[PDB]
Amino acid sequence: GAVDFAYLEGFAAGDFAVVDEVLALFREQAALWAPMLDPTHPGWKDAVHTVKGAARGVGAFNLGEVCERCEAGQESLEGVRTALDAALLDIAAYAHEQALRSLK
Structure with a gap:
């Protein structure tokens, strides 16, 4: 588990609309900033x-x-990128699980 979803659910006071919002904001920030995680990008x-x-x-x-x-x-930009991959993996999967729950 890269992401402590209990923490996020607490931030949301258990409300899944807020969880969904925050996950979407994080994915947006990741999309903006992740391309810059390269030592040749200022x-x-x-x-x-x-x-x-x-x-x-x-x-x-x-x-x-x-x-x-x-x-x-103490860590490389590659290490940041692969940590970011693990967090995105988790976040995307949690969103998927919510959708699956709503279906079944």
């Missing part, structure tokens, strides 16, 4: 900072840590 540092906060906002605590370590020179 956005990279701002991207790591922004991802770090978005991550901690939604319960992707491991991603947040990886970003903090990258800022400390």
Whole structure:
């Protein structure tokens, strides 16, 4: 589990409309900033900072840590990218599960 969905559900006070909103916002931020996670893109540092906060906002605590370590020179941008992949994997799957639940 990359994402602590209990954290996000608490942020939402258990309301799935708010969970759905926040997940969609995170995916939007990821789409904006992830292309900058490349040492040859001058956005990279701002991207790591922004991802770090978005991550901690939604319960992707491991991603947040990886970003903090990258800022400390202890992790690569590749490590941030693969942590971001795991958080997106989780988030997309949670959204899918909600849809499946509504169906069955």
